[PDB]
């Protein structure tokens, strides 16, 4: 009903999606959702019994046969056919997950969103988890320097990321950013991203990527390869590509005009949407 254009996006400091906010939300057992780090699903030693085993100081044993809402994240691991036995539990009303990798209506994707700043005793997390710096940049005048921003660690998924660097590095309509994860390097990254219409947001070790959401919060269009993990985000202004070949200035100019003209479900970018989505169970 209240959909809007990407350029009309406004953010408050608590809007930003992080996995910590959903984990934190689920800590209040009143809301009837159990949060399990995906590793404890993949390497379960019982078919239907799992535990966070002291992750986030949570040592509760979870009986999935008596769990109405399951939420998994804080892991590059996906939910796939290997978890079909858990999905088929008649008692489970919904499975909210990062990296959905099975076309099952019970399994609901949620955005990876931004790095968890509170990740105990981690400098990198403290830096690139700063949502205040995202909010800060998002309120400055958006002045476009170029068409597409490129700043990716190729090593993390080279079959896609190597093609992007090899094909597009030398284009006049591409701006390269050097990887720097200092507090100044992170600010520079966000300011660079903000000053482009698009950024390359290829998948990494995990299918979902922080860069995808960082781009959208800065009202920049992320370019992402089509994947079942992304199939529930088609109502966000993401440019979904079949492959990484034959991206041209004329192609992106046209896609910019089409995407910026449409209305999008931008409330999906705000954590309150996913609180309410869980609260519906
Ligand atoms: O110059 C830069 C570049 C990057 N960054 C930060 O670094 C983050 C990660 O960028 P990288 O390309 O190195 O990492 P990836 O995108 O491959 O991995 C990310 O998404 C996929 C998940 O599986 C990974 O756990 C997550 O780190 C960016 O989202 C951004 O927050 C900077 O702060 N400055
Ligand atoms: Ca690069
Ligand atoms: Ca193509
Ligand atoms: Mg069992
Ligand atoms: Mg996961
Ligand atoms: Mg998951
Ligand atoms: Mg992280
Ligand atoms: Mg990381
Ligand atoms: Mg990029
Ligand atoms: Mg992809
Ligand atoms: Mg063309």
Residue numbers in the entry: -2 to 278
Task: Share the article's original sentences.
We propose that the catalytic mechanism follows a direct displacement SN2‐like reaction, where Asp73 serves as a catalytic base that deprotonates the incoming nucleophile of the acceptor, facilitating direct displacement of the UDP with the inversion of the anomeric configuration of the acceptor without metal ion dependence, while the interactions with side chains of Arg158 and Arg208 stabilize the developing negative charge. In this context, we herein present the structural and biochemical characterization of A075L, a soluble chlorovirus xylosyltransferase easily produced in E. coli and amenable to large‐scale purification.
The density map of UDP‐α‐D‐Xyl identified the sugar donor in a well‐defined pocket where Asn148 coordinates the uracil moiety, and Arg208 and Arg158 coordinate the phosphate groups. In contrast, significant STD signals were observed for the acceptor 6. These results provide support for the proposal that the side chains of Asn148 and Arg208 are key for the binding of the donor, but do not affect the binding of the trisaccharide acceptor. Introduction of point mutations such as N148A and R208A affect the binding of the UDP‐xylose donor, but not the recognition of the acceptors. To understand the details of the glycosyl transfer mechanism, the geometries of A075L in complex with the donor and acceptor were initially superimposed. However, inspection of the superimposed structures showed that the distance between O4 Fuc and C1 Xyl exceeded 3.0 Å, too far for the nucleophilic attack. Hence, we hypothesized that a conformational rearrangement takes place for catalysis to occur.
